[PDB]
Every structure is written in structure tokens, then in C-alpha cells.
Design an enzyme around this catalytic site. Structure first.
Site, PDB file in Angstrom:
ATOM      1  CB  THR A 159      36.543  32.763  55.251  1.00 25.67           C
ATOM      2  OG1 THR A 159      36.772  31.484  55.835  1.00 25.67           O
ATOM      3  CG2 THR A 159      35.669  33.542  56.156  1.00 25.67           C
ATOM      4  CG  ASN A 180      40.580  33.904  52.505  1.00 28.35           C
ATOM      5  OD1 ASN A 180      39.501  34.528  52.417  1.00 28.35           O
ATOM      6  ND2 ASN A 180      40.680  32.742  53.164  1.00 28.35           N
ATOM      7  CG  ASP A 261      37.509  28.475  59.818  1.00 27.28           C
ATOM      8  OD1 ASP A 261      38.454  29.167  60.193  1.00 27.28           O
ATOM      9  OD2 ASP A 261      37.514  28.025  58.677  1.00 27.28           O
ATOM     10  CG  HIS A 309      34.316  27.655  54.047  1.00 31.29           C
ATOM     11  ND1 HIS A 309      34.851  27.049  55.158  1.00 31.29           N
ATOM     12  CD2 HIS A 309      34.649  28.967  54.136  1.00 31.29           C
ATOM     13  CE1 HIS A 309      35.520  27.946  55.879  1.00 31.29           C
ATOM     14  NE2 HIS A 309      35.415  29.107  55.274  1.00 31.29           N
ATOM     15  CG  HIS A 420      38.134  26.049  54.509  1.00 29.61           C
ATOM     16  ND1 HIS A 420      38.056  27.265  53.855  1.00 29.61           N
ATOM     17  CD2 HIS A 420      38.611  26.300  55.746  1.00 29.61           C
ATOM     18  CE1 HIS A 420      38.417  28.226  54.689  1.00 29.61           C
ATOM     19  NE2 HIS A 420      38.728  27.669  55.862  1.00 29.61           N
ATOM     20  CG  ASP A 687      31.934  36.912  28.917  1.00 30.26           C
ATOM     21  OD1 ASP A 687      31.613  35.856  28.355  1.00 30.26           O
ATOM     22  OD2 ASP A 687      31.589  38.056  28.463  1.00 30.26           O
ATOM     23  CG  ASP A 691      32.401  34.212  22.789  1.00 25.51           C
ATOM     24  OD1 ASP A 691      32.338  34.608  23.990  1.00 25.51           O
ATOM     25  OD2 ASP A 691      33.340  33.526  22.300  1.00 25.51           O
TER      26      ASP A 691
HETATM   27  C1  LIG Z   1      26.910  37.486  37.276  1.00 20.66           C
HETATM   28  O1  LIG Z   1      26.139  38.682  37.509  1.00 20.66           O
HETATM   29  C2  LIG Z   1      26.844  39.891  37.214  1.00 20.66           C
HETATM   30  C3  LIG Z   1      25.985  41.122  37.622  1.00 20.66           C
HETATM   31  O2  LIG Z   1      24.839  41.171  36.735  1.00 20.66           O
HETATM   32  C4  LIG Z   1      27.228  39.937  35.704  1.00 20.66           C
HETATM   33  O3  LIG Z   1      28.207  40.964  35.594  1.00 20.66           O
HETATM   34  C5  LIG Z   1      27.807  42.075  34.783  1.00 20.66           C
HETATM   35  O4  LIG Z   1      28.009  41.691  33.414  1.00 20.66           O
HETATM   36  C6  LIG Z   1      28.146  42.686  32.359  1.00 20.66           C
HETATM   37  C7  LIG Z   1      28.921  42.103  31.109  1.00 20.66           C
HETATM   38  O5  LIG Z   1      30.169  41.376  31.385  1.00 20.66           O
HETATM   39  C8  LIG Z   1      28.872  43.980  32.831  1.00 20.66           C
HETATM   40  O6  LIG Z   1      28.496  45.013  31.937  1.00 20.66           O
HETATM   41  C9  LIG Z   1      29.569  45.959  31.678  1.00 20.66           C
HETATM   42  O7  LIG Z   1      29.559  47.051  32.607  1.00 20.66           O
HETATM   43  C10 LIG Z   1      30.467  48.132  32.340  1.00 20.66           C
HETATM   44  C11 LIG Z   1      30.448  49.171  33.475  1.00 20.66           C
HETATM   45  O8  LIG Z   1      30.993  48.497  34.605  1.00 20.66           O
HETATM   46  C12 LIG Z   1      31.054  49.263  35.848  1.00 20.66           C
HETATM   47  O9  LIG Z   1      29.779  49.639  36.387  1.00 20.66           O
HETATM   48  C13 LIG Z   1      28.985  48.613  37.031  1.00 20.66           C
HETATM   49  C14 LIG Z   1      27.647  49.170  37.561  1.00 20.66           C
HETATM   50  O10 LIG Z   1      27.798  49.875  38.793  1.00 20.66           O
HETATM   51  C15 LIG Z   1      29.795  47.868  38.123  1.00 20.66           C
HETATM   52  O11 LIG Z   1      29.015  46.832  38.741  1.00 20.66           O
HETATM   53  C16 LIG Z   1      31.091  47.332  37.507  1.00 20.66           C
HETATM   54  O12 LIG Z   1      31.796  46.535  38.472  1.00 20.66           O
HETATM   55  C17 LIG Z   1      32.832  45.730  37.840  1.00 20.66           C
HETATM   56  O13 LIG Z   1      34.088  46.376  37.665  1.00 20.66           O
HETATM   57  C18 LIG Z   1      34.672  46.870  38.871  1.00 20.66           C
HETATM   58  C19 LIG Z   1      35.956  47.591  38.496  1.00 20.66           C
HETATM   59  O14 LIG Z   1      35.526  48.900  38.173  1.00 20.66           O
HETATM   60  C20 LIG Z   1      34.886  45.766  39.926  1.00 20.66           C
HETATM   61  O15 LIG Z   1      35.151  46.250  41.239  1.00 20.66           O
HETATM   62  C21 LIG Z   1      33.643  44.891  40.045  1.00 20.66           C
HETATM   63  O16 LIG Z   1      33.971  43.781  40.882  1.00 20.66           O
HETATM   64  C22 LIG Z   1      33.128  44.461  38.650  1.00 20.66           C
HETATM   65  O17 LIG Z   1      34.139  43.749  37.931  1.00 20.66           O
HETATM   66  C23 LIG Z   1      33.603  42.604  37.210  1.00 20.66           C
HETATM   67  O18 LIG Z   1      32.982  42.983  35.967  1.00 20.66           O
HETATM   68  C24 LIG Z   1      33.872  43.587  35.005  1.00 20.66           C
HETATM   69  C25 LIG Z   1      33.098  44.071  33.779  1.00 20.66           C
HETATM   70  O19 LIG Z   1      32.328  45.191  34.190  1.00 20.66           O
HETATM   71  C26 LIG Z   1      35.031  42.611  34.680  1.00 20.66           C
HETATM   72  O20 LIG Z   1      35.970  43.219  33.814  1.00 20.66           O
HETATM   73  C27 LIG Z   1      35.737  42.112  35.977  1.00 20.66           C
HETATM   74  O21 LIG Z   1      36.696  41.122  35.666  1.00 20.66           O
HETATM   75  C28 LIG Z   1      34.722  41.568  37.003  1.00 20.66           C
HETATM   76  O22 LIG Z   1      34.190  40.331  36.534  1.00 20.66           O
HETATM   77  C29 LIG Z   1      31.900  48.514  36.918  1.00 20.66           C
HETATM   78  O23 LIG Z   1      32.343  49.366  37.974  1.00 20.66           O
HETATM   79  C30 LIG Z   1      30.189  48.725  30.951  1.00 20.66           C
HETATM   80  O24 LIG Z   1      31.145  49.727  30.693  1.00 20.66           O
HETATM   81  C31 LIG Z   1      30.250  47.616  29.878  1.00 20.66           C
HETATM   82  O25 LIG Z   1      29.943  48.120  28.568  1.00 20.66           O
HETATM   83  C32 LIG Z   1      30.894  47.777  27.507  1.00 20.66           C
HETATM   84  O26 LIG Z   1      30.513  46.635  26.748  1.00 20.66           O
HETATM   85  C33 LIG Z   1      29.233  46.815  26.147  1.00 20.66           C
HETATM   86  C34 LIG Z   1      28.708  45.505  25.571  1.00 20.66           C
HETATM   87  O27 LIG Z   1      27.299  45.558  25.623  1.00 20.66           O
HETATM   88  C35 LIG Z   1      29.213  47.956  25.111  1.00 20.66           C
HETATM   89  O28 LIG Z   1      27.882  48.319  24.812  1.00 20.66           O
HETATM   90  C36 LIG Z   1      29.874  49.230  25.629  1.00 20.66           C
HETATM   91  O29 LIG Z   1      30.250  49.992  24.505  1.00 20.66           O
HETATM   92  C37 LIG Z   1      31.097  48.958  26.516  1.00 20.66           C
HETATM   93  O30 LIG Z   1      32.183  48.735  25.626  1.00 20.66           O
HETATM   94  C38 LIG Z   1      33.290  49.639  25.918  1.00 20.66           C
HETATM   95  O31 LIG Z   1      34.214  49.058  26.838  1.00 20.66           O
HETATM   96  C39 LIG Z   1      34.876  47.880  26.357  1.00 20.66           C
HETATM   97  C40 LIG Z   1      35.720  47.298  27.489  1.00 20.66           C
HETATM   98  O32 LIG Z   1      36.650  48.278  27.901  1.00 20.66           O
HETATM   99  C41 LIG Z   1      35.690  48.212  25.078  1.00 20.66           C
HETATM  100  O33 LIG Z   1      36.359  47.082  24.540  1.00 20.66           O
HETATM  101  C42 LIG Z   1      34.788  48.884  24.013  1.00 20.66           C
HETATM  102  O34 LIG Z   1      35.483  49.109  22.773  1.00 20.66           O
HETATM  103  C43 LIG Z   1      34.026  50.095  24.635  1.00 20.66           C
HETATM  104  O35 LIG Z   1      34.851  51.205  24.971  1.00 20.66           O
HETATM  105  C44 LIG Z   1      29.297  46.462  30.270  1.00 20.66           C
HETATM  106  O36 LIG Z   1      27.939  46.858  30.329  1.00 20.66           O
HETATM  107  C45 LIG Z   1      28.581  44.401  34.291  1.00 20.66           C
HETATM  108  O37 LIG Z   1      29.444  45.433  34.741  1.00 20.66           O
HETATM  109  C46 LIG Z   1      28.772  43.205  35.210  1.00 20.66           C
HETATM  110  N1  LIG Z   1      28.563  43.537  36.624  1.00 20.66           N
HETATM  111  C47 LIG Z   1      29.287  43.095  37.645  1.00 20.66           C
HETATM  112  C48 LIG Z   1      28.863  43.558  39.048  1.00 20.66           C
HETATM  113  O38 LIG Z   1      30.228  42.276  37.563  1.00 20.66           O
HETATM  114  C49 LIG Z   1      27.794  38.576  35.284  1.00 20.66           C
HETATM  115  O39 LIG Z   1      27.914  38.583  33.828  1.00 20.66           O
HETATM  116  C50 LIG Z   1      27.003  37.349  35.761  1.00 20.66           C
HETATM  117  N2  LIG Z   1      27.765  36.164  35.390  1.00 20.66           N
HETATM  118  C51 LIG Z   1      27.174  35.226  34.599  1.00 20.66           C
HETATM  119  C52 LIG Z   1      28.044  34.061  34.208  1.00 20.66           C
HETATM  120  O40 LIG Z   1      25.962  35.258  34.282  1.00 20.66           O
HETATM  121 CA   LIG Z   2      31.829  35.160  26.159  1.00 25.37          CA
HETATM  122 ZN   LIG Z   3      39.180  28.520  57.696  1.00 27.85          ZN
END
Ligand SMILES: *[C@@H]1O[C@H](CO)[C@@H](O[C@@H]2O[C@H](CO)[C@@H](O[C@@H]3O[C@H](CO[C@H]4O[C@H](CO)[C@@H](O)[C@H](O[C@H]5O[C@H](CO)[C@@H](O)[C@H](O)[C@@H]5O[C@H]5O[C@H](CO)[C@@H](O)[C@H](O)[C@@H]5O)[C@@H]4O)[C@@H](O)[C@H](O[C@H]4O[C@H](CO)[C@@H](O)[C@H](O)[C@@H]4O[C@H]4O[C@H](CO)[C@@H](O)[C@H](O)[C@@H]4O)[C@@H]3O)[C@H](O)[C@H]2NC(C)=O)[C@H](O)[C@H]1NC(C)=O
Ligand SMILES: [Ca+2]
Ligand SMILES: [Zn+2]
Ligand SMILES: Cc1cc(C)c(C(C)(C)CCOC(=O)C(C)(C)C)c(O)c1
Ligand code: NA
Ligand code: NA
Length: 806
Positions: A159, A180, A261, A309, A420, A687, A691
Site C-alpha cells: 500500500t 511497508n 483491502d 494494488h 498482496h 541504478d 554506466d
Molecule cells: C526515476 O526518476 C528519478 C527522478 O528524476 C531519477 O532519480 C534521480 O537520478 C539522479 C542520478 O542517480 C540523481 O542525481 C543525483 O542527485 C544528487 C543530489 O541528490 C539530492 O537532491 C535531490 C533534488 O532535490 C533529491 O531529489 C535527492 O533525493 C534522493 O536522496 C534522498 C536522501 O537525501 C532520498 O530521500 C530520496 O528518496 C532520493 O534518494 C534516491 O536517489 C539517490 C541519489 O540521489 C539514491 O542514492 C537513493 O538510493 C534513492 O534512489 C537528494 O536529496 C547529486 O548530488 C548527484 O550528483 C553526483 O553525481 C554526479 C553525476 O553526474 C556528479 O556530477 C556530482 O559530482 C555528484 O558526485 C558526487 O557525489 C557522489 C556520490 O556521493 C560521489 O561519489 C562523487 O565523488 C561526488 O562527491 C546526482 O545529480 C537524483 O537525485 C535522482 N532523484 C531522485 C528523486 O531519486 C531516477 O534515476 C529515475 N530512474 C530511472 C531508472 O530512470
Molecule cells: Ca548504472
Molecule cells: Zn492490504
């Protein structure tokens, strides 16, 4: 602490949140144990029930009553929903014939059609047909509005992951609500349905629709409801908000129902006890639509009727116990039920080993009802890996079953008949979508689609710019009369090189051999024309894929196939070929079994070499365009070019060879030709995205040849299969897969048998959307068709599920 001694007078169901410690009067105050002392008295009135009766008509107003039947109730916006029917001779909405809503018909002061989301928990898709006789209001919405036969939830089909995916457009791995129940090892904190941790905003990622709306100046009703507020009061509160002055009135509203549900868990999805919950939900829809009709809003508002669902038959006796597989069962923590997630019980235990746990859980009992995976090896269509809250070990549980750690967990931690959570392609997990109102189409059926696409459409309906999400904006334009979003195709970033013959045979020192040196005027011209692209219209049917990142690559043409060859990854990004219904399959001739040929258009330095495969004792190779499907013995030599070779584990070559030798020709026979685009995928950080070169974790030993994590194929033909795939005038039909490139076939318990008994089953499990391949490759397909772009967006989001009919 809350100073519960403040008052809700004049504040009932107030929209702004009052921060601690002042007491609250909103929809959710009960959930936060924060309501003012007088909230029940003032805000949850129940006197005289929910319906006007003949004798209440014209009554003197008594503010005590749950709703009103006095002549002032319409100005006050607080009539019982059936007031005009009982007191003023009007019809119930459900009794009126449906009439097309061509334009919004809104009261003065309405800047846009409001959006009302009416959400139902556990509402399985087949209820729309199976329960239609007891759901007249829902059946009218469905038949007169826009409906899908079903809508596909996200995995896991629980859910909160689904509700939050509806609200955000994001996969659970991205929004963070991956179950959940969850443990986040960075926070060292546990999220549960019970308790206060779930209220902490740190769990909730992305941007839900109510926040999107607010940030862009579109007012939202309070987004959810404390469970104890009765449905009738929820509807009356929504209708009351709709009578607020223009400047105060929300534009987006949500109703949620805990049924069907709640009863489905107790009674099973089709328990005879389930009729009543369906009738009660229909009656609530009828209260809403009658209420809208009273307000003259029934041809103004867009209503979405949507579920999270479905519900499957699951009983206590169909539980697998990890204690029957694992010797060390007290050393692990299991998140149990319709999915399993395993991690070490203690981080201080240096004798925890995930490989031994997976091995002990793999094909150990003949009818075993779950399958273990490391999360990166789960079907990519689940998009269920890229979050630290998702444990490395996952158990995909068969429909109708549960997994648990030990038997005592099932009777000292029985009763239930439904649940579910399972794989989101399972038929019983599908749910519902209907859209009704001026912005939706009239009497229109649309194909099934995924719930991640709805956030964009809700934004479209509210005039909002969506936050970045995983929908494909424009893919659901066919649901809409107006407010469509007309996307433009992305710009190609890298242009290809078109190499001619540039290298002699002796410049290559690849360690390859081929028995190809046995020997004209017009015949040689003809093959020169093939190498310049003279057959490309036949094999590249929808244009070449655009490369949407910066890289160096070559287009290579051949009689039977065309490829985009990466000079950086030393292999094709894509290989495209068409196989007609009349095509014939041939063998690889004996003298060519080990044939690999230098490609005189591509430098030795940008080529693979055979010596690396000789020396890597774990790794072999295959070809992307299949030698079995060559058009002639002479054309067959092109299939052994080094630029068509890709690294393949021998266990994977079993799978790949059967697809190429048997299945492609089967699909061409069944579909009247197919066009195939195949290639590698590299996703070592799981991800879902292509890559870069520096993320690659494995190379063919001693070389720079990167090893793919997956191989994909996109298989396209004419939807009207009376036309051959290469002469198709209308819409297309596609099916695709993303196969894990694994060194064993431990996923397939029957793999010791002939490929005919297991390969196609594996492929069906790893079915994919073209869009999933797009994210994984940085390529953009279907660039040149005669079809509208939104239609091609819908084709790219299609998933071939192989489930029988709903
Ligand atoms: C589905 O759609 C979504 C939305 O479009 C796609 O997700 C986006 O993909 C991007 C790449 O993976 C990602 O971009 C990164 O953002 C970083 C900043 O992140 C914060 O700010 C945003 C904006 O407000 C926010 O939305 C983020 O939210 C995430 O993290 C919080 C925790 O703080 C969670 O609550 C939240 O649920 C979400 O987590 C998810 O995403 C993160 C990654 O952000 C995952 O780790 C989680 O598991 C989870 O899936 C954040 O609050 C930014 O810092 C990144 O930049 C780094 O990499 C780039 C590469 O271009 C580089 O230029 C920079 O230098 C930087 O590197 C530095 O950091 C590295 C890591 O520490 C380090 O190794 C280096 O050496 C450097 O120091 C990057 O831009 C974007 O945040 C997410 N957005 C969301 C909402 O998830 C998704 O890809 C789509 N899926 C598909 C299959 O298409
Ligand atoms: Ca990848
Ligand atoms: Zn249920
Ligand atoms: C505006 C709006 C939009 C949508 C889509 C909803 C639904 C119906 C889906 C529910 C969302 O609830 C969630 O996300 C939880 C946080 C409760 C898990 C809503 O309440 C309000
Ligand atoms: Na080898
Ligand atoms: Na096997």
C-alpha cells in the site's frame, strides 16, 4: 507535547497546518494525537446520520446534525448529499444518462476544473467487471469516462509504496518507501506501519503532488485522512471545501478508502463477504457525485478513480519456512510475507555470508514457492535495487504464497485469506483506473498502463510542471481531450562516423582465425553497395537510434544487419536486423565454427581480440546479429566480423543461442516478420541507468573489453499482422527483454533440461519496456516512423507481460 486545551471552533478540517504545540483541527490530527479537546464534538458530528428524509426537508437548522436539510444548506455548502433528490425532486447522478462533457461547465470564479482523486486500497482490476452489478456509480464513471482494463502497480505491490508512487511518479527505489516495513542502515532507524518513525519526513523522498501544487500556487486539500474519520464525513468535508471562496478553495482533493483491502485480507479477493464492501464503496462514489451535482460541479470536476494494488488468495498453510533451508536461521533477519528481504541479524557477526545463504535457498525443493536473488539480479522491470533500504538478498515469492523465518512466526506472531505484495506483473495484483470529467475523453477505453505515469497527467490536469519523475510525459496523452503535453524528441548528442575500408588484414594481430579465403564484376559491386547501406531500409526500419550522450561510434552496414559500433566499449551499442516470415534458419557451417574476422573498417586498436577470450577461462563470446539467420552463405561471413562479437559466459550462450536459432524465427512466423535490435547493457551500480566507462567492474581477462551486465533485444512488428513488419502502414507492436548476463543458470531450476523447457520462461520473467532499455543505454529508439510522437511514447512504455487474460 500538545496543548489540547485550544479549540476547533470555526477551524473544523482547516487547511493550514498548525505547528506544535498548538492543537490541530485538520484531517490528520487523530493520527498525530494532536486534535483540540473539542474536535469530536464540533468536527465529527453524527446526529441524525448522513441522509435527508422527507420530514427533514425545510427543517429549521440544528447545528448539531451531521449534515443539513434546511433551506439554507446549499448556501452554507453543508447539505446531506441526497438533499436535492429527497427535498427538491432531483435525480441521483447515477440515474442520469451520460452526456458528453465537451467543455468544462463550471460556476463563476472557478479558474480551472478541480481534480478529485478517489483512491481505493486493494481494489483488484477484475472487480470492475466482476462487481459491476453492485457498483452502478463506478460502472457509470467507467463506461462514460476514460478507463483502462487495468493499471499496473509498482513492486512491491504493497500500500504505502504504491500510494506514494501514485503521488510522486517515482519508483519506490527512488522515493524511498520500498516496503511497508524498512530499516535504513544510515539512519539506524526502522519504519513501520505502527508507530511514530513513519511520520519523520526523512523517509519520504521525491515531491508528492500536494507539494508540487503548493509550490506552484495551486491549493491542495489536506492530502490524507485519519482512519477513524468515517467516509461520509470525508465526502462532506471535500464538498464543504469546494464551497470555500475562490481565493481559499483548493484545486486538488483526495479521498481514500481502506476498503476493499480490509475485508479482502480477511475473506480473499472473491469471498462472498466482498460484495458488501464493493456496494459501500459505490455508495460513497454516489454521495460524492450527487454532492457535486448539487454544487453544479458534476460537469466541471475531473474525477480519477484509482487503486493502489489488487489482492490474491493467500492462506497460512501456504507458507515456506526458511528454517527448512538454512542451518543458521537465527543469524538472519527476514522481512517476511509476500516478498522476502534478508540481512544479517548482527553487524558484528563476521561469519555471515550472503553467498552461502543464497546457495542454501536455491532450487532445494521440487515445488519450491520462492526464488532467491541478489537484488541486482532481480528483473530490471521491477526497478527494485537502488536504495540502501532494500536488502541485498531478496526472495521473489510465488503468487498465493508467503515466506516466513520459522513456523512459530505464523501462529505466535489461522485467519487471513487474502494478501498482496507479489511481482507487479501478476494478474491478481493489477488495479484500476477511470478518469471522468471535461479533460478526459468520452466513452474511451485505453490500454493498460503503469501507475508511475499518472503523476504527470495529474500535473497536466492542474496546469503544473511535474517534478522530475519516472513517468514518460506524453505517453498518456491519449487519455485526454485537452491539456496534452506535447513533448519534442531529445536531441542526438553524438553523431556517428561512417568508416570505409581503411585497414589491411595484416595490420591486425588479434589472434583470430577464419577459414574465409576461398574466391565478380557486378557481384563485387553489389556487396560494395551493401557495405554502403543499400539494404539499410530493410534492416533499420524506424531510423537509427539516437545516442544521447557524448561518445565515439561508427555506423557499420551489412547485407543482413546494421550496427552502431562503440570505439570506447569495443562492441556495438545496438545491432538492427529484420527477419521476414519467409526467412530460413541455417547452421553455422563446420569450417566456420571458430571463425572470427577482422573488420577492415575499424582499427586494430578499437577492436576486440580472440586471444583475450582464449586466455579468460570463464568467458566465451557470441554474436549480436545471429549467423543462423544469414540471408546467404556469402552474407554469413559478415556475422563473424570481430565488430559483431560480444563477451558471453558459456552458461549465458545456452540462452542466447536458443533465442537466436529458435525464438527469433518463431516470432517472425507468428508476427509476420520482426525487426530486432539487440545490444549490451552495463549497469554495475544497479541504478537502472547506463554506466560510464569508469563504473565497469569486470573486463575480459587481460583486456579492455568490458563485460555487459545484461543483453537486451527489442522485437518490433506491425500491430496489424496481415502486414509484414517491413511494410507496415499503421501502429506497431513490440516486446522486449533485458536478460541478466550471468555465469550460471542457477535462476532457472530446470536448466539441466533442453533449452526448449526453460529459456523462454527465463526471457518472459525478464520482459522489459523499450523505455527501460533507453535508460540503461542512453539510446533513443523509433526516431523515424510515420507515427505521432505521443503514440511512440506509449509504445515505448509498453510491457509484454505474458499473463493470460484478466
Ligand atoms: C526515476 O526518476 C528519478 C527522478 O528524476 C531519477 O532519480 C534521480 O537520478 C539522479 C542520478 O542517480 C540523481 O542525481 C543525483 O542527485 C544528487 C543530489 O541528490 C539530492 O537532491 C535531490 C533534488 O532535490 C533529491 O531529489 C535527492 O533525493 C534522493 O536522496 C534522498 C536522501 O537525501 C532520498 O530521500 C530520496 O528518496 C532520493 O534518494 C534516491 O536517489 C539517490 C541519489 O540521489 C539514491 O542514492 C537513493 O538510493 C534513492 O534512489 C537528494 O536529496 C547529486 O548530488 C548527484 O550528483 C553526483 O553525481 C554526479 C553525476 O553526474 C556528479 O556530477 C556530482 O559530482 C555528484 O558526485 C558526487 O557525489 C557522489 C556520490 O556521493 C560521489 O561519489 C562523487 O565523488 C561526488 O562527491 C546526482 O545529480 C537524483 O537525485 C535522482 N532523484 C531522485 C528523486 O531519486 C531516477 O534515476 C529515475 N530512474 C530511472 C531508472 O530512470
Ligand atoms: Ca548504472
Ligand atoms: Zn492490504
Ligand atoms: C494530492 C494527492 C495525490 C495522491 C496521488 C493521493 C493518494 C490518494 C494516492 C494517496 C497518497 O498517499 C501517500 O502517498 C501516503 C503518504 C499516505 C503513503 C493523495 O492522497 C493526495
Ligand atoms: Na574463454
Ligand atoms: Na539451473
Amino acid at each position: 507535547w500538545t496543548a489540547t486545551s485550544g479549540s476547533c471552533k470555526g477551524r473544523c478540517f482547516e487547511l493550514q497546518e498548525v505547528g506544535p504545540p498548538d492543537c490541530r483541527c485538520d484531517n490528520l490530527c487523530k493520527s498525530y494525537s494532536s486534535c483540540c479537546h473539542d474536535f469530536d464534538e464540533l468536527c465529527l458530528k453524527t446526529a441524525r446520520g448522513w441522509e435527508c428524509t422527507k420530514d427533514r426537508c425545510g427543517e429549521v437548522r440544528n447545528e448539531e446534525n451531521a449534515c443539513h436539510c434546511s433551506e439554507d444548506c446549499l448556501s452554507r455548502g453543508d447539505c446531506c448529499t441526497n438533499y436535492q433528490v429527497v427535498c427538491k425532486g432531483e435525480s441521483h447522478w447515477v440515474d442520469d444518462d451520460c452526456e458528453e462533457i465537451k467543455v468544462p461547465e463550471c460556476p463563476a470564479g472557478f479558474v480551472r476544473p478541480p481534480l478529485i482523486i478517489f483512491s481505493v486500497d486493494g481494489f483488484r482490476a477484475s472487480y470492475m467487471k466482476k462487481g459491476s452489478k453492485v457498483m452502478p456509480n463506478i460502472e457509470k464513471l467507467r463506461s462514460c469516462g476514460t478507463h483502462a482494463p487495468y493499471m499496473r502497480p509498482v513492486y512491491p505491490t504493497k500500500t504505502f509504496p504504491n500510494l506514494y508512487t501514485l503521488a510522486t511518479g517515482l519508483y519506490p527505489e527512488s522515493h524511498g518507501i520500498v516496503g511497508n516495513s524498512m530499516y535504513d542502515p544510515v539512519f539506524d532507524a526502522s519504519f513501520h506501519l505502527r508507530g511514530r518513525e513513519k511520520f519523520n519526513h526523512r523517509w519520504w523522498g521525491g515531491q508528492p503532488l500536494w507539494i508540487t501544487a503548493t509550490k506552484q500556487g495551486v491549493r491542495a486539500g489536506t492530502f490524507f485522512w485519519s482512519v477513524s474519520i468515517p467516509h461520509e464525513r470525508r465526502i462532506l468535508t471535500i464538498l464543504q471545501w469546494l464551497s470555500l471562496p475562490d481565493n481559499e478553495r483548493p484545486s486538488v482533493y483526495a479521498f481514500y478508502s481502506e476498503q476493499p483491502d480490509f475485508s479482502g485480507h480477511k475473506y480473499g479477493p472473491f469471498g462472498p463477504e466482498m460484495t458488501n464492501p464493493l456496494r459501500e464503496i459505490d455508495k460513497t462514489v454516489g454521495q460524492l457525485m450527487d454532492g457535486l451535482k448539487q454544487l453544479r460541479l458534476h460537469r466541471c470536476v475531473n474525477v480519477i478513480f484509482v487503486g493502489d494494488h489488487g489482492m490474491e488468495d493467500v492462506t497460512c498453510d501456504r507458507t515456506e519456512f526458511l528454517s527448512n533451508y538454512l542451518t543458521n536461521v537465527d543469524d538472519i533477519t527476514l522481512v517476511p510475507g509476500t516478498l522476502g528481504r534478508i540481512r544479517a541479524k548482527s553487524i558484528n557477526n563476521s561469519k555471515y555470508d550472503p553467498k552461502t545463504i543464497i546457495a542454501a535457498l536455491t532450487c532445494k525443493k521440487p515445488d519450491q514457492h520462492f526464488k532467491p536473488y541478489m537484488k541486482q539480479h532481480l528483473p530490471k522491470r521491477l526497478h527494485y535495487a537502488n536504495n540502501r533500504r532494500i536488502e541485498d538478498i531478496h526472495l521473489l515469492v510465488d503468487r498465493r504464497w508467503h515466506v516466513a523465518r520459522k513456523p512459530l512466526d505464523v501462529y505466535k506472531k489461522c485467519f487471513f485469506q487474502g494478501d498482496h505484495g507479489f511481482d507487479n506483473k501478476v494478474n491478481s495484483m493489477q488495479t484500476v483506473f477511470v478518469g471522468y470529467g471535461p479533460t478526459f475523453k468520452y466513452r474511451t477505453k485505453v490500454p493498460p498502463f503503469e501507475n508511475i505515469e499518472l503523476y504527470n497527467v495529474m500535473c497536466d490536469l492542474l496546469g503544473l510542471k511535474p517534478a522530475p519523475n519516472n513517468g514518460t510525459h506524453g505517453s498518456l496523452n491519449h487519455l485526454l481531450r485537452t491539456n496534452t503535453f506535447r513533448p519534442t524528441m531529445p536531441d542526438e548528442v553524438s553523431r556517428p562516423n561512417y568508416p570505409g575500408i581503411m585497414y589491411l588484414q595484416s595490420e591486425f594481430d588479434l589472434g583470430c582465425t577464419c577459414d574465409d579465403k576461398v574466391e565478380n564484376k557486378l557481384e563485387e559491386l553489389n556487396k560494395r553497395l551493401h557495405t554502403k547501406g543499400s539494404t539499410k531500409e530493410r534492416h533499420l526500419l524506424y531510423g537509427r537510434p539516437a545516442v544521447l550522450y557524448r561518445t565515439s561510434y561508427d555506423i557499420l552496414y551489412h547485407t543482413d544487419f546494421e550496427s552502431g559500433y562503440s570505439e570506447i566499449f569495443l562492441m556495438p551499442l545496438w545491432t538492427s536486423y529484420t527477419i521476414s516470415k519467409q526467412a530460413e534458419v541455417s547452421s553455422i557451417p563446420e569450417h566456420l565454427t571458430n571463425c572470427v574476422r577482422p573488420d577492415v573498417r575499424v582499427s586494430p586498436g578499437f577492436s576486440q581480440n580472440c586471444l583475450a577470450y582464449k586466455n579468460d577461462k570463464q568467458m566465451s563470446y557470441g554474436f549480436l546479429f545471429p549467423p543462423y539467420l544469414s540471408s546467404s552463405p556469402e552474407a554469413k561471413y559478415d556475422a563473424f566480423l570481430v565488430t559483431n562479437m560480444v563477451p558471453m559466459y558459456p552458461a549465458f550462450k545456452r540462452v542466447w543461442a536458443y533465442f537466436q536459432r529458435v525464438l527469433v524465427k518463431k516470432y517472425a512466423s507468428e508476427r509476420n516478420g520482426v525487426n530486432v535490435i539487440s545490444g549490451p547493457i552495463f549497469d554495475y551500480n544497479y541504478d537502472g541507468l547506463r554506466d560510464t566507462e569508469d563504473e565497469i567492474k569486470q573486463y575480459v581477462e587481460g583486456s579492455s573489453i568490458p563485460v555487459p551486465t545484461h543483453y537486451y533485444s527489442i522485437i518490433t512488428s506491425c500491430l496489424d499482422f496481415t502486414q509484414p513488419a517491413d511494410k507496415c502502414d499503421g501502429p506497431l507492436s513490440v516486446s522486449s527483454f533485458i536478460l541478466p548476463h550471468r555465469p550460471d543458470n542457477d535462476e532457472s531450476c530446470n536448466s539441466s533440461e533442453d533449452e526448449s523447457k526453460w529459456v523462454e520462461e527465463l526471457m518472459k520473467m525478464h520482459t522489459a519496456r523499450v523505455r527501460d532499455i533507453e535508460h540503461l543505454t542512453g539510446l533513443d529508439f523509433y526516431r523515424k516512423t510515420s507515427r505521432s510522437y505521443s503514440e511512440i511514447l506509449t509504445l515505448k512504455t509498453y510491457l509484454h507481460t505474458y499473463e493470460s487474460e484478466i
